[PDB]
Amino acid sequence: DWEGRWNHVKKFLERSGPFTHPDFEPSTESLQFLLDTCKVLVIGAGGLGCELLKNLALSGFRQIHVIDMDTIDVSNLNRQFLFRPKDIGRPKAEVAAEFLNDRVPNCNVVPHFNKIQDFNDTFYRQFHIIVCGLDSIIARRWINGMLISLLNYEDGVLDPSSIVPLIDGGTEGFKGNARVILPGMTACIECTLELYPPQVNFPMATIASMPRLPEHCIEYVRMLQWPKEQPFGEGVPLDGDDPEHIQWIFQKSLERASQYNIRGVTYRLTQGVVKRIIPAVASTNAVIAAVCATEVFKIATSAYIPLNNYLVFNDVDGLYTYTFEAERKENCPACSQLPQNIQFSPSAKLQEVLDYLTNSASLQMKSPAITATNRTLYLQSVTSIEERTRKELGLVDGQEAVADVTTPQTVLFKLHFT
Amino acid sequence: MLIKVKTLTGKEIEIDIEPTDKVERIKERVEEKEGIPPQQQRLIYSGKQMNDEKTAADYKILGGSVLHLVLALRGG
Amino acid sequence: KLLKEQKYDRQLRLWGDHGQEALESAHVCLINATATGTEILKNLVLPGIGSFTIIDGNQVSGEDAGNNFFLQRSSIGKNRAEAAMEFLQELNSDVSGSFVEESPENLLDNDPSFFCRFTVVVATQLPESTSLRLADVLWNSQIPLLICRTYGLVGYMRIIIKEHPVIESHPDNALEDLRLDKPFPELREHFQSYDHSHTPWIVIIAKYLAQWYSETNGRIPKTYKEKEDFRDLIRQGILKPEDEENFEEAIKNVNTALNTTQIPSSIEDIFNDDRCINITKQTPSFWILARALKEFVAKEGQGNLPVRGTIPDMIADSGKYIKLQNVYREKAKKDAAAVGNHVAKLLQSIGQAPESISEKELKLLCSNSAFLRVVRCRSLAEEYGLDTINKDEIISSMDNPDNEIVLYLMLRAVDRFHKQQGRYPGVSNYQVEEDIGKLKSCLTGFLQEYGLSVMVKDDYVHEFCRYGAAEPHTIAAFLGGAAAQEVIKIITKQFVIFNNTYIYSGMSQTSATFQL
Ligand SMILES: Nc1ncnc2c1ncn2[C@@H]1O[C@H](COP(=O)(O)OP(=O)(O)OP(=O)(O)O)[C@@H](O)[C@H]1O
């Protein structure tokens, strides 16, 4: 909107180039267009979110929406620059936009104090690109679905203008990863689902019978001792963020540690164990976010070739970044054009279809639900399951198909496996 | 056969593997030299991500071919 | 007071309170305050860095306020340095900001001894003339320099520290120091001292190992034929049909457990370093501890480093696991003092009082004995020297016209083109055409002055002219992120700094570290 402002962008849109993407047209109009027409949703507003918003804003984007279910907490102020202590307690999404729409002259950021799973296709169809900066997997998986259901198939053929580019960002300490997705072409989130490490899960046995680490003590005072002697009144849940709660858990983990004389219980650790905290700092987020950012700008302007669906980053030993093109599993429970033609047995029943979906390291669904042809074969989602928490009867009734699943937020879609 | 499996910090360790060793073993070889639990290793040879049930040959791994340890992250 | 811990918690879980302590006591000097410089400082101010001083002589341009998240239109015309300061200043009320309304050149002239006040100097977007000149003054003054640069979609970043030793290395995945291969008395005595699943997997392997010692005298060091059979031996110990999860665990562990003891190549190289061998009142804290270690190895270390004293978790009885833990803990504490003595003795044969080194430094140095790491950077001058230019590495890489190093050369080229022309390759929209040829004439001119027989796709020449020396924010951001961390690694002496030049490509979204 003023002299010389967007020079650091015009040069990539106004000028032609060697590595320029094919569909690239060098125009003086290109910019204004981006600024007026390009709608971009930014999921999450903390660490990545903040950084993302900044990057996008100064890259030439005006129409930006930010979604985010959380409310600012002091412990964010060490890397989520868009928040100040006075802002504590406020809606992250709100403040985020508030600040950004101010620092950057004519930006038009729209906040959404919601959790992505609040909207339905209708909503997401709006945007051209979507960038993630979520701190859970489910969420990623979920939005991954939603973005596929938008795909429109013209008799086996995918309509190009029904694909919404989904760029994802990941952080965790000094390590990070960024990827580009084109649901229905490039590998989805569900495709490279096993690239995620194994969540360290303590066998309850040791937690109650044979503790060894300070962690095992805390995890006890949390996973069991609290639910037992209702610490702060009956029914009351364990609010990980409520000091007095941690202080108690700390105190009790401190006493437990003493019983089996395991040293090493610090308040800070009691929080770690309880909140399942992930160490983080600005440094990293900056990097990853700055990458996804560029990609979006690439995708949106086509001024360069979009990254090939992957990049891993690591600061611990010097700087390192492997960049590869993950393969799209031709049987992705999610991005599979057709159903999941996969029979897991002939004679062997249907208790063998839940445990498959729930454990198979390729689906990992959480408390799923199977539908058939339209009768409900129990869904743990509360009284509609009890009427079926109950078999070779229908273990044959299914014939020999298109049993149909849908996991609690695992995916927004309805999974169809045969 | 002598392959190199670049760690997640680009260290790049060298390994002795015959085109019949299950991928699963390829990992134990890494853990032997680096102490990287096989549980949390995700190998990647030219896009394809090694399945610890197949064989080095199954993925066309030959001579001085480079494998990459990789990772996906939760936080944000 | 206790409000700070709540604030920097998520980062204290990375570099502890002590790291924070060091960080909160540093003082960074950011040379030019553009997008890159600003982003870098931002990623430091938030972490609570002690204090910073921005030295910028320029005035805020419209295009500046356009790519800087710390410069509003309202600040156009004022002093970029001052202007920027006031905004970053806001990020953290626990950081002390200062500025200098003068240029770097203007300083390297009228008062070089200035930068001696800083912990680390971070220079951003500098022309050759100034880079070389600064990387020198700072080098002599013993100041760490970090030259960062954003050009188009290329992120350039070279670090310059004569020598940087680090004790707390923080390594992702290393081999446990169980040392079953060369066990120590107490440990051995512990094993001799031996509810079946409630047994540490080590003991399990230690026992079945002790047995394999009699029926052979062997060690199971052969590898494939033995280790495997050793396992099978461990199965022949399963109780009448029950469990033995730990047993199976033991088994899986046999792939490691056997040889875990041996001095790491990297350390030997330290031990063998001149700084470690010839000591003087001059020799710094670190190196003494290094020798103090070597001496331990030679004498009571019986060939190897001190025992780490940490053991992985393992399915085991509560008190049983602990007792085992302690065995190691105690041994480690002993070897600890051992190394502690050699230290004193050394400090003595030099003058400095045996209390010149804290017990904390010692007990740490030992735990990370096997992870020590030292980094020496070639002075900037040496890399730009005609006889010294590490041209082996340049050519070695260029065996792939799409190797990030191309970009390095290109910059050198551009930089030449600048000194020569007075402006950069195609800043204005018409200079493109004209300059493309002019630029290549410099890429070559450069390549000959050093005698580098390499092929640079003409494309990279057009490209850079296209960039028009633009500082895209998403690039400056990336760079500011990676850079910021290095600055910390330096301040905290807590991790391993990358060595020599780092290069990031926006187009390919790829990077590579270089020469050394
Ligand atoms: N399923 C979800 N739907 C919408 N927003 C989400 C979802 N999950 C996380 N977010 C938001 O994503 C961001 C996660 O990044 P952030 O690093 O701040 O994590 P926390 O703040 O979740 O964790 P921490 O306590 O370690 O800071 C937050 O802004 C959070 O509210």
Provide φ and ψ at C201, rounded to 5°: -60, -30
Q: Across the interface, do C318 and A287 touch by the CB < 8 Å criterion? A: no
Chains A and C: how many Cβ contacts under 8 Å?
228
The candidate with the shortest Cα–Cα distance to C41, out of C435, C497, C393, C480, is C480
Amino acid at C487: V
| C-alpha torsion B15→B19→B23→B26, nearest 10 | -10
**C157 pairs with which residues across the strands?**
C148, C502
Provide φ and ψ at B20, rounded to 5°: -155, -10
Angstrom distance (rounded) from CA C92 to CA C23: 14
Alpha carbon distance, N-terminus to C-terminus of chain A: 56
- What DSSP string describes B1-49? -EEEEE-TTS--EEEE--TTSBHHHHHHHHHHHH---GGG--EEETTEE
Angstrom distance (rounded) from CA C179 to CA C184: 8
The answer to whether the beta carbons of residues A56 and A40 sit under 8 Å apart is yes
**B13 pairs with which residues across the strands?**
B5
Domain positions in chain C are 1-173+370-516, 174-369
For the stretch A382-385, contacts whose Cβ atoms lie closer than 8 Å and that sit 24 or more positions apart, written own/partner, are none
Q: Is C274 exposed, middle or buried (0-12, 13-18, 19+ CB in 10 A)?
A: exposed
Q: Across the interface, do A47 and B75 touch by the CB < 8 Å criterion? A: yes
Q: Which residues contact A168 (CB under 8 A, 6 or more apart)?
A: A131, A132, A140, A178, A179, A181, A189, A292
The candidate with the shortest Cα–Cα distance to A124, out of A406, A409, A412, is A412
What count of other Cβ atoms lies within 10 Å of the Cβ of residue A22? 6
Angstrom distance (rounded) from CA A74 to CA A93: 15
Write down the residue that tokens 């390994």 correspond to.
B15
CA-angle at A343, arms to A342 and A344, nearest 5°: 115
Stated as kind and residue range, the H or E segment containing C97 is strand C96-100
The candidate with the shortest Cα–Cα distance to C497, out of C250, C164, C172, is C164
A135 touching chain C per CB within 8 A = no
Angstrom distance (rounded) from CA A131 to CA A49: 9
Q: CA of A393: how far to CAs of A348, A397, A398, C413, C483, in Å?
A: 12, 7, 9, 77, 64
The candidate with the shortest Cα–Cα distance to A307, out of A199, A178, A183, is A178
Q: How far is the CA of A130 from the centre of ligand 1 (A)?
A: 16
Closest chain A CA to residue C496: A317
Angstrom distance (rounded) from CA B17 to CA B63: 9
* Tokens coding A132: 């993630």
Angstrom distance (rounded) from CA B29 to CA C408: 37
CATH number of the domain residue B53 falls in: 3.10.20.90
Region label for C515, one of left (φ > 0), alpha (ψ between -120 and 50) or beta (otherwise) = beta
* Tokens coding C444: 């070559």
The answer to whether the beta carbons of residues C145 and C55 sit under 8 Å apart is no
* Tokens coding C494: 């807590």
- DSSP letter at C246 equals H
- Three-state secondary structure call for residue C121: strand
| C-alpha torsion A101→A106→A111→A117, nearest 10 | -130
Which residues form ligand 1's pocket by a CB distance below 6 Å? Answer: A 44-47, 49, 67-70, 75-76, 92, 115-116, 134-136, 139, 277-278, 280; B 75-76; C 10
CA-angle at A212, arms to A210 and A215, nearest 5°: 110
Q: How many residues does chain A have?
A: 418
Q: Which residues contact A38 (CB under 8 A, 6 or more apart)?
A: A61, A62, A63, A128, A129, A300
Angstrom distance (rounded) from CA A64 to CA A146: 19
Q: CA of A160: how far to CAs of A191, A306, B12, C243, C493, in Å?
A: 20, 16, 40, 56, 51
Q: Across the interface, do A78 and C46 touch by the CB < 8 Å criterion? A: yes
**Contact map slice: B 19-58 vs A, CB within 8 A:** 39-40, 42, 44, 47-49
Burial C74-95 (b: 16+ CB within 10 A, else e): ebbeebbbbbbbebbbebbeeb
Angstrom distance (rounded) from CA C431 to CA C426: 5
* Tokens coding C379: 């002075």
Q: Which residues contact C337 (CB under 8 A, 6 or more apart)?
A: none
Provide φ and ψ at B3, rounded to 5°: -105, 160
Provide φ and ψ at B16, rounded to 5°: -100, 110
3-state secondary structure chain A: CCCCCCHHHHHHHCCCCCCCCCCCCCCCCHHHHHHHHCCEEEECCCCHHHHHHHHHHHHCCCEEEEECCCECCHHHCCCCCCCCHHHCCCEHHHHHHHHHHHHCCCCEEEEECCCHHHCCHHHHCCCCEEEECCCCHHHHHHHHHHHHHCCCEECCEECHHHCCCEEEEEEECCEEEEEEECECCECCCCCCHHHCCCCCCCCHHHHHCCCCCHHHHHHHHHHCHHHHCCCCCCCCCCCCCCHHHHHHHHHHHHHHHHHCCCCCCCHHHHHHHHHCCCCCCHHHHHHHHHHHHHHHHHHHHCCCCCCCCCEEEECCECCEEECCCCCCCCCCCCCCCCCECCCCCCCCCCCCCHHHHHHCCCCCCCCCEEEECCEEEEECCCHHHHCCCCCCCHHHHCCCCCCEECCCCCCCCCEEEC
* Tokens coding B49: 């991500």
The answer to whether the beta carbons of residues C309 and C174 sit under 8 Å apart is no
Give strand ranges (E) for C142-239: 145-151, 154-160, 164-166
* Tokens coding A170: 């990941």
- DSSP letter at B75 equals B
Amino acid at A96: A
Amino acid at A143: I
Mutate to test the interface with B, among C10, C169, C173 (most CBs of B within 10 A): C173
Quickly name the fold that domain C1-173+370-516 has: Rossmann fold (3.40.50)
Of C47, C488, C506, the CB nearest to A294: C506
Burial C225-235 (b: 16+ CB within 10 A, else e): ebbeebbebbe
Edge-to-edge strand ranges of the sheet holding B13-16: B13-16, B2-6, B66-69, B43-45, B48-49
Q: Are strands B13-16 and B2-6 parallel, antiparallel or unpaired?
A: antiparallel
3-state secondary structure C41-96: HHHHHCCCCCEEEEECCCECCHHHHCCCCCCCHHHCCCEHHHHHHHHHHHHCCCCE
Q: Which residues contact A390 (CB under 8 A, 6 or more apart)?
A: A378
Q: Across the interface, do B31 and C174 touch by the CB < 8 Å criterion? A: no
Angstrom distance (rounded) from CA C439 to CA C425: 7
* Tokens coding A216: 């095992």
Angstrom distance (rounded) from CA A220 to CA C342: 44
Angstrom distance (rounded) from CA C7 to CA C92: 11
The answer to whether the beta carbons of residues C196 and C239 sit under 8 Å apart is yes
Q: How many CA atoms lie within 13 A of C155 on its CB side?
A: 32
Angstrom distance (rounded) from CA A285 to CA C382: 34
- DSSP letter at C372 equals -
The candidate with the shortest Cα–Cα distance to C305, out of C184, C190, C206, is C184
Burial B1-19 (b: 16+ CB within 10 A, else e): bebebbbbbbeebebebee
Q: Across the interface, do C474 and A290 touch by the CB < 8 Å criterion? A: yes
Provide φ and ψ at A407, rounded to 5°: -95, 145
* Tokens coding C473: 């924010």
Angstrom distance (rounded) from CA C211 to CA A226: 47
Stated as kind and residue range, the H or E segment containing C373 is strand C373-375
The candidate with the shortest Cα–Cα distance to A238, out of A208, A275, A202, A267, is A275
- Three-state secondary structure call for residue C116: helix
What count of other Cβ atoms lies within 10 Å of the Cβ of residue A261? 10
* Tokens coding C252: 């899986």
Burial C291-320 (b: 16+ CB within 10 A, else e): bbbbbbbeeebeebbbbbbebeebbbbbeb
| C-alpha torsion C500→C504→C510→C514, nearest 10 | -20
Angstrom distance (rounded) from CA C60 to CA A11: 20
Angstrom distance (rounded) from CA C466 to CA C433: 10
Provide φ and ψ at C196, rounded to 5°: -125, -30
Stated as kind and residue range, the H or E segment containing C375 is strand C373-375
Stated as kind and residue range, the H or E segment containing C30 is strand C28-30
Q: Are strands A311-314 and C502-505 parallel, antiparallel or unpaired?
A: unpaired
CA-angle at B62, arms to B56 and B67, nearest 5°: 65
Closest chain C CA to residue B11: C172
Q: CA of A307: how far to CAs of A192, A295, C286, in Å?
A: 16, 7, 43
* Tokens coding A197: 């490490």
The answer to whether the beta carbons of residues C481 and A286 sit under 8 Å apart is yes
Q: How was this structure determined?
A: X-ray
Q: Are strands A175-181 and B13-16 parallel, antiparallel or unpaired?
A: unpaired
- Three-state secondary structure call for residue C248: helix
Provide φ and ψ at C254, rounded to 5°: -55, -20
Q: Across the interface, do A211 and C14 touch by the CB < 8 Å criterion? A: no
* Tokens coding C214: 């009699």
Q: Which residues contact C52 (CB under 8 A, 6 or more apart)?
A: C27, C28, C29, C30, C41, C44, C45, C88, C95, C96, C97, C98
Of A44, A176, A324, the CB nearest to B73: A176
Q: How many CA atoms lie within 13 A of C230 on its CB side?
A: 30
Angstrom distance (rounded) from CA C196 to CA B68: 40
The candidate with the shortest Cα–Cα distance to C267, out of C235, C303, C224, is C303
Q: Please name each of the domains of chain A with its CATH number.
A: 1-198+278-328 (3.40.50.720), 201-277 (1.10.10.520), 329-384 (3.10.20.260)
Chains A and B: how many Cβ contacts under 8 Å?
85
The candidate with the shortest Cα–Cα distance to A111, out of A120, A99, A127, A121, is A99
Angstrom distance (rounded) from CA A96 to CA C168: 37
Provide φ and ψ at C65, rounded to 5°: -55, -15
Provide φ and ψ at C98, rounded to 5°: -145, 165
Q: Are strands A63-67 and A40-43 parallel, antiparallel or unpaired?
A: parallel
